[PDB]
Amino acid sequence: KDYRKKYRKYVRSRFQCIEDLNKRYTRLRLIKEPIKMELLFDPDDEHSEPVHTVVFQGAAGIGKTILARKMMLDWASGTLYQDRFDYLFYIHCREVSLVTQRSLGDLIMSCCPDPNPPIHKIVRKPSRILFLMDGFDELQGAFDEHIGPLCTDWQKAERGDILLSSLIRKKLLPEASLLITTRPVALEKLQHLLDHPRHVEILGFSEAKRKEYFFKYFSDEAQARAAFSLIQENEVLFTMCFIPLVCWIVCTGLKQQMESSLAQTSKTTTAVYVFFLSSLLQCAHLWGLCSLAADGIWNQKILFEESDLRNHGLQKADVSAFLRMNLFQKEVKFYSFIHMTFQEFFAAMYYLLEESRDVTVLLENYGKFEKGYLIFVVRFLFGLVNQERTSYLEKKLSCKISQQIRLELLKWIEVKAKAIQPSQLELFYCLYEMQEEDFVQRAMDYFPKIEINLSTRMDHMVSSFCIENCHRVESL
Numbered sequence: 001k002d003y004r005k006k007y008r009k010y011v012r013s014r015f016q017c018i019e020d021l022n023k024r025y026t027r028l029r030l031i032k033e034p035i036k037m038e039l040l041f042d043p044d045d046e047h048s049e050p051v052h053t054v055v056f057q058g059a060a061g062i063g064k065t066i067l068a069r070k071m072m073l074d075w076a077s078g079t080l081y082q083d084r085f086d087y088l089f090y091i092h093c094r095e096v097s098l099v100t101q102r103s104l105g106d107l108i109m110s111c112c113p114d115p116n117p118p119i120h121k122i123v124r125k126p127s128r129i130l131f132l133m134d135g136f137d138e139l140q141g142a143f144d145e146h147i148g149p150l151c152t153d154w155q156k157a158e159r160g161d162i163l164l165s166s167l168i169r170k171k172l173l174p175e176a177s178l179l180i181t182t183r184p185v186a187l188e189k190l191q192h193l194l195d196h197p198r199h200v201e202i203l204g205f206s207e208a209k210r211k212e213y214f215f216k217y218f219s220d221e222a223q224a225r226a227a228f229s230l231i232q233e234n235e236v237l238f239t240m241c242f243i244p245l246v247c248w249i250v251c252t253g254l255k256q257q258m259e260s261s262l263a264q265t266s267k268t269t270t271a272v273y274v275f276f277l278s279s280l281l282q283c284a285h286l287w288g289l290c291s292l293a294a295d296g297i298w299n300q301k302i303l304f305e306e307s308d309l310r311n312h313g314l315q316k317a318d319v320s321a322f323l324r325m326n327l328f329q330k331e332v333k334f335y336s337f338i339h340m341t342f343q344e345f346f347a348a349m350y351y352l353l354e355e356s357r358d359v360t361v362l363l364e365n366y367g368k369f370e371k372g373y374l375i376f377v378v379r380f381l382f383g384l385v386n387q388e389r390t391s392y393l394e395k396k397l398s399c400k401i402s403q404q405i406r407l408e409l410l411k412w413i414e415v416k417a418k419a420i421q422p423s424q425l426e427l428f429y430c431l432y433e434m435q436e437e438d439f440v441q442r443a444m445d446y447f448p449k450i451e452i453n454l455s456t457r458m459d460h461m462v463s464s465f466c467i468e469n470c471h472r473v474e475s476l
């Protein structure tokens with residue numbers, strides 16, 4: 001009662017910003033598989049028995065973290081689940097070690113402000129607890145389905161993977177509620193652990209909310225209308241801006257153009273990322289940024305210490321400049337890239353830099369949870385390897401290595417196409433990034449039949465481009 005008040009006050013302060021003012025928050029579209037947040041845990045016709053597990057699947061950059069942080073803030077302010085949950089515990093998955101031994105009590109205490117929380121009091125009513133697991137796909141290391149034995153004691157220290165598996169399977173605090181957010185790529189791994197989950201999909205920004213975002217980002221109404229009109233004129237940007245991270249990336253780059261006229265002709269997500277990074281260029285620490293990202297991807301480190309950045313040649317003034325440029329993020333003496341997609345962009349760039357590791361071993365670990373799935377590393381490799389595209393940033397890349405990698409990617413597509421890791425639609429996202437018709441046409445010939453499941457206008461745009469470049473050699 002008195003501790004619940006002290007805890008709620010702490011949650012209200014630490015969840016006030018997107019960075020850690022939640023007035024820049026724009027409503028995200030959620031669908032059940034127009035769901036009202038307050039009714040998420042209500043049974044439909046489950047004879048009055050509530051739903052204890054809710055899974056929010058959402059693409060990278062769709063706003064899973066922002067939605068989870070808004071949920072924490074709304075609840076702490078008495079706006080959400082006021083009469084349903086005494087406690088909401090935010091489990092930031094990227095900070096949870098899968099090997100360190102810890103109890104569920106230690107985990108709950110790590111979410112508390114003070115060193116001595118009344119853990120026995122908190123756990124007295126498990127059904128009044130909602131565990132908000134943000135970013136299942138961001139748990140560093142392997143998350144094996146065979147792990148065990150399962151734990152049924154909230155006080156027992158277990159390896160992080162056994163602890164989280166026991167919690168997800170509802171072995172530990174069986175009637176506590178659980179809200180897990182994940183990229184659709186990890187849904188395969190997660191579904192095996194889930195007990196009667198309610199599945200919800202985060203679709204991102206509607207066309208109306210895309211405009212709303214641009215108008216909220218730009219203080220000047222004239223600048224907001226000019227930036228939104230640019231997006232309306234460009235099919236690719238208009239279509240990609242359903243992803244709130246893309247809205248932020250585009251708005252940020254257009255802001256610098258406004259300082260110095262508005263024109264963005266980006267046709268791929270690689271073009272969008274290069275356009276953004278080019279706006280920060282006044283670059284010296286490119287080999288250091290790329291090696292840091294590649295080391296963090298291959299060795300599973302999303303949070304870096306001051307010691308980690310020092311190992312890659314990033315001094316005090318450099319880490320402060322990257323923080324100001326919105327390339328680095330300050331997290332709880334820990335640093336990370338502003339988004340995991342940027343860490344994967346610099347990891348892809350590491351393989352092409354001229355002064356570079358083996359792309360064959362990288363492709364062997366593609367689609368593995370242990371490595372983060374390497375979706376954007378591979379997509380950005382297809383994009384950056386495109387010779388028909390250049391910039392000052394891309395001039396630092398080697399044409400010799402890019403030509404070798406281009407041949408390896410074509411041989412990789414051939415095997416995937418000729419023979420469940422990269423779907424056919426995922427190969428289309430890769431080919432769409434490549435853009436270059438000779439490669440695209442050669443790769444499209446490897447497919448014996450087109451078998452795709454389209455869900456979004458982005459899926460249609462990408463697959464339609466690939467199918468238009470899939471014409472039989474003999475045809476006409």
Ligand SMILES: CC(C)(O)c1ncc([S@](N)(=O)=NC(=O)Nc2c3c(cc4c2CCC4)CCC3)s1
Pocket residue numbers: 058059060061183184185240243245246269341375376423425426429458
């Ligand atoms: C295709 C399928 C089912 O295999 C996947 N669906 C979602 C994913 S993922 N990697 O989890 N998210 C994403 O692709 N996001 C993105 C991102 C950008 C652009 C686009 C998308 C998706 C559309 C264009 C830039 C920043 C993140 S993979």
Ligand SMILES: Nc1ncnc2c1ncn2[C@@H]1O[C@H](COP(=O)(O)OP(=O)(O)O)[C@@H](O)[C@H]1O
Pocket residue numbers: 018024025026027028058059060061062063064065066067244245246248339
């Ligand atoms: N609803 C939203 N309103 C405003 N900005 C948002 C929203 N959702 C996401 N963003 C923007 O997108 C970025 C990435 O969102 P995030 O939730 O971290 O993505 P994900 O968790 O899906 O990987 C945020 O840093 C912010 O700039």
